[PDB]
């Protein structure tokens, strides 16, 4: 029971409200 998933990206940027 998995589902596929496509679509990569590291534009996280900013970290002001995020954190690592």
């Keep these: 029971k998995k589902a ?3 679509g990569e990206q590291i ?3 900013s970290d ?3 954190t690592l």
Excluded: A, F, G, W
Aim: hydrophobic share 45%; aromatic share 0%.
């Design 4 to 6: 596929v998933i496509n």
């Design 11 to 13: 534009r996280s940027i």
């Design 16 to 18: 002001l409200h995020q």
